[PDB]
C-alpha cells in the first residue's frame, strides 16, 4: 500500500519508484541465483554481485552512489530514504505540515462595523465547515429522521 500501483482513468497506471527499484533488485538477485546453480565463470558472477550491491545501494538511497540510476523518465528514480528526508519528504512536510478537515479559505475584506472579538463569515463556508454540527442539531431537534 505504501508503494501502491493505483489505477489511472483511461487505462494507464501510476506507481512509485520504489516499485521498479524493488523489481530491478529482485531481477539481479534471481540472475545471481541462476548463475550460482550454473557455476558460471567467477568474472560474470562477480559482476552480478557488484551489480546487486549497486541495486540495493541505490534502493536505500540515491546520493552516495554516483549516478542516480533514472528510468524512462528523464528524472532520477526516487528511492527509499528520499521519502523520509528533504522538504518534500514525510518528516519535514507531511508529518508536521498537513491538510485539515473542517477548514476553509477565502478572500478577506474589511467590514469595520463589527467588534474586535469577532469576525464575519460567509454563510456558505459557515454551512460547510459546521456541517456535522448542524446534522447533530437537526437530529437533536427531530427536525429530521436520520443523518441521510
Amino acid at each position: 500500500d505504501l508503494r501502491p500501483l493505483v489505477p489511472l482513468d483511461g487505462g494507464r497506471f501510476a506507481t512509485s519508484d520504489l516499485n521498479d527499484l524493488y523489481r530491478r533488485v529482485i531481477n539481479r538477485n534471481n540472475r545471481l541465483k541462476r548463475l550460482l546453480d550454473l557455476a558460471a565463470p567467477d568474472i560474470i558472477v562477480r559482476n552480478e554481485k557488484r551489480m546487486l550491491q549497486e541495486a540495493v545501494d541505490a534502493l536505500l538511497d540515491n546520493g552516495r552512489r554516483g549516478r542516480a540510476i533514472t528510468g524512462s523518465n528523464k528524472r532520477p528514480l526516487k528511492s527509499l530514504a528520499d521519502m523520509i528526508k528533504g522538504k518534500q519528504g514525510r518528516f519535514r512536510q507531511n508529518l508536521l505540515g498537513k491538510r485539515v478537515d473542517y477548514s476553509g479559505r477565502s478572500v478577506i475584506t474589511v467590514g469595520p462595523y463589527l467588534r474586535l472579538h469577532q469576525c464575519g463569515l460567509p454563510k456558505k463556508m459557515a454551512l460547510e465547515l459546521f456541517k456535522p454540527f448542524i446534522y447533530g442539531k437537526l437530529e437533536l431537534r427531530g427536525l429530521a429522521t436520520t443523518i441521510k
Binding site: 559482476n47 557488484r50 551489480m51 549497486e54 554516483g66 549516478r67
Partner: peptide, 29 residues
Amino acid sequence: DMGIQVMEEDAAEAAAQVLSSVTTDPVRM
C-alpha cells in the same frame, strides 16, 4: 561536508582523512 559548501561556477578531519588516501561505475569496472 568538511563542511565546505562546494558549488559549480566529525567530518572535517574525517573527510580530510578520506581526502588523504591518495571510479566505481560498474560499466567502467
